[PDB]
Amino acid sequence: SMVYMNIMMAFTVSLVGLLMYRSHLMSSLLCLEGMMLSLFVMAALTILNSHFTLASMMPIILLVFAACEAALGLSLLVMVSNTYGTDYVQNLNLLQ
């Protein structure tokens, strides 16, 4: 119903201009963990009314990697501030 349009409008918390930009890179890793619960909820609304009885273990497992994923990504974001003190995505040295 309208309970899916909101929330499919709320999947646009990626929006890629604000998925790596601008600086204070913690603001970009924020919406990477906040892009979940637009997948954790959008799955949970579908498994639950339509009684699948078995696929509802999948929303439990959906958090378990994305927590461990983002925790890894947060380890490296200390290493960019361990060498500097500021994350500041307009750091660029290795060109392309």
Partner 1 sequence: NPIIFIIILLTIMLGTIIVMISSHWLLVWIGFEMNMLAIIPIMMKNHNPRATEASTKYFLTQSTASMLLMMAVIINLMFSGQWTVMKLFNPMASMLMTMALAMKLGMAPFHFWVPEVTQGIPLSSGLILLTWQKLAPMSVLYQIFPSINLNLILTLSVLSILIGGWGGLNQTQLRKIMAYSSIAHMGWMTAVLPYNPTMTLLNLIIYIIMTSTMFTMFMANSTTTTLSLSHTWNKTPIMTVLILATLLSMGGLPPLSGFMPKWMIIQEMTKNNSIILPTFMAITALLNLYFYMRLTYSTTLTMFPSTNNMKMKWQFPLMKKMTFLPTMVVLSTMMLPLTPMLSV
Partner 2 sequence: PFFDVQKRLGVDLDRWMTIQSAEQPHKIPSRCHAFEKEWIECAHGIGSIRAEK
Binding site for partner 2 (CB under 8 A): 49-55, 57-58
CA gap 74, 24 in Å, rounded: 13
> Which residues have a C–N gap over 2.5 Å right after them in the chain?
none
Q: Scanning the structure block, which residue is given the tokens 């349009």?
A: 5
- Are the beta carbons of 70 and 29 closer than 8 angstroms? yes
Closest distance of CB 26 from partner 2, Å: 37
Residue 20 contact among partner 1, partner 2, none, beta carbon within 5 to 8 Å by kind = partner 1
- Are the beta carbons of 43 and 54 closer than 8 angstroms? no
Under rule CB under 8 A, residue 77 binds partner 1: yes
Contacting positions for partner 1 (CB under 8 A)? 11, 14, 16, 19-20, 28-29, 32, 35, 39, 42-43, 46, 50, 52, 58, 61-62, 65, 68-69, 72-73, 76-77, 79-80, 83, 91, 93-96
